[PDB]
Subunit: 382 residues, 4 copies
Amino acid sequence: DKLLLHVGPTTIKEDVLVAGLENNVGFTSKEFVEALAYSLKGLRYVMGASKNYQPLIIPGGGTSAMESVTSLLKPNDKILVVSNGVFGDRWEQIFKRYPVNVKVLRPSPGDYVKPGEVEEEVRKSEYKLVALTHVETSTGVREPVKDVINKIRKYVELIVVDGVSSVGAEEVKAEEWNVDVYLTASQKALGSAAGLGLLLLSPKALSILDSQNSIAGYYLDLRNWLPVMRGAEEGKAAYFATPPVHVILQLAEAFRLIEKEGIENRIKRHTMVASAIRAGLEALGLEIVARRPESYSNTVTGVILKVADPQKVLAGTVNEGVEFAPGVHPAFKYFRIGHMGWVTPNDAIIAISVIERTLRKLGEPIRFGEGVKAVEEVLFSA
Amino acid sequence: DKLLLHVGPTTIKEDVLVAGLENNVGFTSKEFVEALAYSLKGLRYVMGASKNYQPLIIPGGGTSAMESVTSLLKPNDKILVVSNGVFGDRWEQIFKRYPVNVKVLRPSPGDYVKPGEVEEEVRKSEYKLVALTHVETSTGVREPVKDVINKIRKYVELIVVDGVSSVGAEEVKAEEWNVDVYLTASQKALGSAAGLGLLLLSPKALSILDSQNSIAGYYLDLRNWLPVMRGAEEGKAAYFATPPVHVILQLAEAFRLIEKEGIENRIKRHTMVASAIRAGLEALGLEIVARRPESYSNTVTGVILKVADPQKVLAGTVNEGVEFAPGVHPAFKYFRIGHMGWVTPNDAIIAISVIERTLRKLGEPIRFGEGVKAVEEVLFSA
Amino acid sequence: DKLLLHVGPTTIKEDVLVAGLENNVGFTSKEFVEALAYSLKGLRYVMGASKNYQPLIIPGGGTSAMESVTSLLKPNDKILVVSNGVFGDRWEQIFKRYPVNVKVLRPSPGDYVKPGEVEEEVRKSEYKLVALTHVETSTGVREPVKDVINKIRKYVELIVVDGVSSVGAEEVKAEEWNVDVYLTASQKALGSAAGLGLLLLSPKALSILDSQNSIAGYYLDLRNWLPVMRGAEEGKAAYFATPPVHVILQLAEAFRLIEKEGIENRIKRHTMVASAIRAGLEALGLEIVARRPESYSNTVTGVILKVADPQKVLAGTVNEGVEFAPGVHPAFKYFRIGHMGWVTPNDAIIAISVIERTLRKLGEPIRFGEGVKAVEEVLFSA
Amino acid sequence: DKLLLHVGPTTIKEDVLVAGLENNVGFTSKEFVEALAYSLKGLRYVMGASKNYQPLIIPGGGTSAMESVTSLLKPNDKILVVSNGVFGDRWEQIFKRYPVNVKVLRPSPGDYVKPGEVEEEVRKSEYKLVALTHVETSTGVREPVKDVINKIRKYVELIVVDGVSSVGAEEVKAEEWNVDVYLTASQKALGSAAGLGLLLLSPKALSILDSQNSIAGYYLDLRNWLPVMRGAEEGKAAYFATPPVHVILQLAEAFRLIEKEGIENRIKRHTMVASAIRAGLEALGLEIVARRPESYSNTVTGVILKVADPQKVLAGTVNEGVEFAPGVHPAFKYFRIGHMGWVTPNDAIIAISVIERTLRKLGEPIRFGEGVKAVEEVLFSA
Ligand SMILES: Cc1ncc(COP(=O)(O)O)c(CN)c1O
Ligand SMILES: Cc1ncc(COP(=O)(O)O)c(CN)c1O
Ligand SMILES: Cc1ncc(COP(=O)(O)O)c(CN)c1O
Ligand SMILES: Cc1ncc(COP(=O)(O)O)c(CN)c1O
């Protein structure tokens, strides 16, 4: 019966996986072209953008989408990374491989960089590109990206947001907020199979691709994928390199279900489920990793353990039918709950119940019983 | 009932697709680790290599596997590409993005570069790396890789072979032939879902990764994927970047079926089917694109059309229940047959039958009836 | 790659089987009710009947549908069975269990009972019920049911036709021809999973169910299933006994595909494929079991073997990737080809090719080569 | 994400459904014969019986298996039915169609017939057959079958038990308890797809089939299915009437999983889950339909509603992601929980949570919060 409440893949709807069972479909096939076109439109929809913004779906995942941003860069370009933890630091790790200049702002552990501190930095020095993380998966911290952008937009040429753990769950307004690259992956809050990175580009980013050279490699140069994406939307097949055909069939079904629910409702569901889970944790007397309550993400929650060993908690919860994620930040001793994608009020009950039973057996100080009760309470106020 | 006799994906066995229907599996899951370990061993098996050779399975496909070879290179390295057509030329297109020096040898259209000509060139200039294409998909031409390598091995540091349209269908002996990188994709003669590049590295290539810097980017630096692969074989999960989890489940099932059939039998099946198809084409009085009979690949055959329009043949054959591939070489007017993966003697009958009926309707001069008869004859001598 | 060219199940379309993958559907579920209603309408469509005719879908298959006809009978009722072989004789075997009087007409082996001979019998004696077989699966013989009925309609109270191997492949006009019960199964020319019998009742048969007692048992009394069928069409769930829920989901998808193709086209496809196969057999110099050419059914062909052992032919063809059916009539030494459901021109080529190769190996006198050629010829005249 | 906590089908494991995706399997196919043989052995295993007891798997379900017991009867035979409700009464409804004499014992509503009362009746009159219901699905009442049989065995010729809602969940010892027919269906505690009745016959029942005539019809005469079952176990195909081939593939996979878990563990799991659910109901202050605690079945629990309308509860719970079953007994106002098959401790938490939230909204007097707490408590004492 095992539940996957991990950081992605999470539990995938059966209808989504089943869409990948076509034994005679390839990259030129009519069924593929249609699924690709449909998914490109789905991307515009979940990110809040009109047809002026160009969607791309490329092989790999969040990390390949991130590296592909080098398609917009030239040697010696100046980049500012606003990093709240592991995945903010990945921008720096990627850019270390390229002839570019990188400055990184970091907050105290588990905190977030204030919009004021980013504003101050973009006024001090001239940046070609600013990189933000919408939800930092290592700590469960959501950056106030709208607030940051409103402040910095006029000082910088390009703004990119890693929405890998946010798109499909948190409010995203790529066009309204004037983001140049908003990216995500297939296996998180979109709730589909892994193997794709997804990007939405502003007209300004698109102009760079159409008119300038870049420092990109071959596979991850977005100029190489553009003909494939443009073609698909005009109902034509084009070939750059073979895409994950069947993973894209599954993505199109995920997007069908997302449009059926509606993005607003889907955001509200994530807010409810996450608040319900956080109520349960607090009632138990457990501390959340994220330092600032306004930054509690609706996809990931870090749970601090004062006594028990996170490793044993994880081994134990799998035994009781839920796979959670390990905590990977040197400043904290914790584990993570992934609550995203197709997550329901019932998943919130199971999560807090499995946490209660596992911690009681391992001798972590908690208020047994209080957790599920607090969850039920929040779910009732729906 | 439509047949996919394309260049990859081709028709995928139902058992293979079904293996991807596990809705609660992620990159740390025990089921994933096991499928990854199993597939890594399968790779050693289909490429003819002992445990001293290191397998890697990365996201994307043949093009990402090819680009990842930059992990073995330094600025100003000298590379020789032996190119028989489109996919040989892709090596040059990739290496144009990197600070390296590239020389390319090309034969007459539809021919292949003789081992003597490669020998001569590696004696004239000192090369860090030589790139070969086992089967050139654009023309259906198989390079005598063993013969080339026996001649050049002592003159060059590193030898890589693009086995994208050969591995799982043609004889491959990576260790015996002393190849440093043998690569392929998931969606060709392996007969699985698209989304993966596969590589097998010699101890010498492995030593470079373990001890030297390179010109690689981030996502395609093989050093970043090595911990994941090493870990999986020791039954441990490790994370670099999310792999196409469910595509890997499918690959492990493909490898289970391959081991059941046996690699030698599988090679024999491809040889039979391809010879049977070529007999049918010849009986019809159709010319094959590949110039030299010793190079007729057992995965792809280019079919020259003297009168009818290839585009119309393709539209027509889909109507009669087979999707073939377009011919993409400026020197020829043709279409391509993909005969690889799970292909059977019965697929050979259908292919030549659908070709007969389609060409008859479009007015291409052929000997009606003779095709299927010649196919049946070859199949009967099994 | 094995082909199932048997008498039912035959090869099932993937889309049909996949429709059965819903892990949370039961007999009251909205998805089930909808599939049941849809299939009941599909039944009216493939049998040529308006809304005045009542469809029923019951558990089991052709034999349970046949036995359920006892729902229309009283003790001492007089029945005439027109039997062309094994499945005509099944009517008598069923009715032997009931307090009824049965007379059977039979022709010479492999022949059919002429409409004149049935007319003569219904004039001599008064019958409550006449039972016909549309296609007799043991011999491949199609009875001219329209001609029989036109002659006998005025002399008899009730006419039932076993369309198990005819519905979905041969012309069926239940209302126009004034049939009282036309029945079939799910696993034949409808091309779906086994586990259901299907019946279409005239207003006169329906009046019997609504107003009279019968000799029926419990499970197979159609009066017990009527509330379930009527309910489903009015969008309501009702319970008699648990039906094969998921088999019914698959049937609804089969009917979706049938309506997409159109019944007329589907009949034409079966006629083409069967004629193509018969041309191949004749060109080979093989004799067909059915004695009279006007009775050659378009779903089944019996193939006489003069020398080889049918058992060995069957073992051999499975080896070459096609499962045919055994010949089970004491008067003949033969095997059977099932060509029904999703059968295509390509299946006809494979069938005759596999027959040629298998017979050549076993030393049955045939004209090698001529078979496939004659098939191709008929397919070309499409 | 909807849960099916109904009376059968319940939620089916994905592995089980997937086993039915084989598009080229029929009744003579080697894959079918193997699945049938395997399932017949599985039946002996879950019912506690050696090879002397004969398993049969027939089309339809529990009602067809029940009617097939007429295969053991002769005109004027005397039958005693011990009926605890709806499905006990079905025995009488079936036997009303046959030339037999039926006496029925019934207890007060929601109670059960004591072994003493059955003993008294079998001493007063001589009975050919006694029919028992192991779990009466309408009320959730388990009959102490072992105790009844120990008392009556010497006074009656044949004993049959309807184990439709018990086999795979409750202890069953058919051989040790000397039962002549123990029957069930595919879609209940076995957790597979609907479409099959399953029966296990004693040597004495088998002797009747082999040596005597009966009052059975045709399709449900077990003598007609015996050659099919005997054949399959000796690895040979035989044909009586087409079985639900793909449903049988699924059943064999269900039995594979059952053997993996072990029958004793599976019984313990059902006991735990059911006790946990009953604790939750009691903590809420809800009354259970079953009158006598020793008879609380571990597959079904009737829940009495004092204020709210059962119909609205059912409509509401579907909305909150669980489908339960309606209450169908004139003496009570209630709904039913099905907790059987693949049911887990986590399903118990969800069930009582969904019940709490739904009842709170409809104004049924309950102790909010107390339910889940009591469930968690029982699960923790595992
Ligand atoms: C915020 C964030 N950004 C980037 C990534 C990298 O994504 P991927 O593993 O798909 O390459 C992740 C990893 N889940 C992530 O959570
Ligand atoms: C010989 C050859 N090499 C490289 C490639 C590129 O592979 P991919 O499309 O999977 O990136 C192909 C494409 N079929 C190929 O056939
Ligand atoms: C003509 C005919 N009638 C009746 C039947 C009985 O159908 P079933 O096996 O589904 O009970 C068959 C068997 N395929 C048949 O071919
Ligand atoms: C105890 C009992 N016996 C008999 C039956 C009848 O079974 P079916 O609906 O499969 O015919 C049922 C129905 N669930 C049952 O629960």
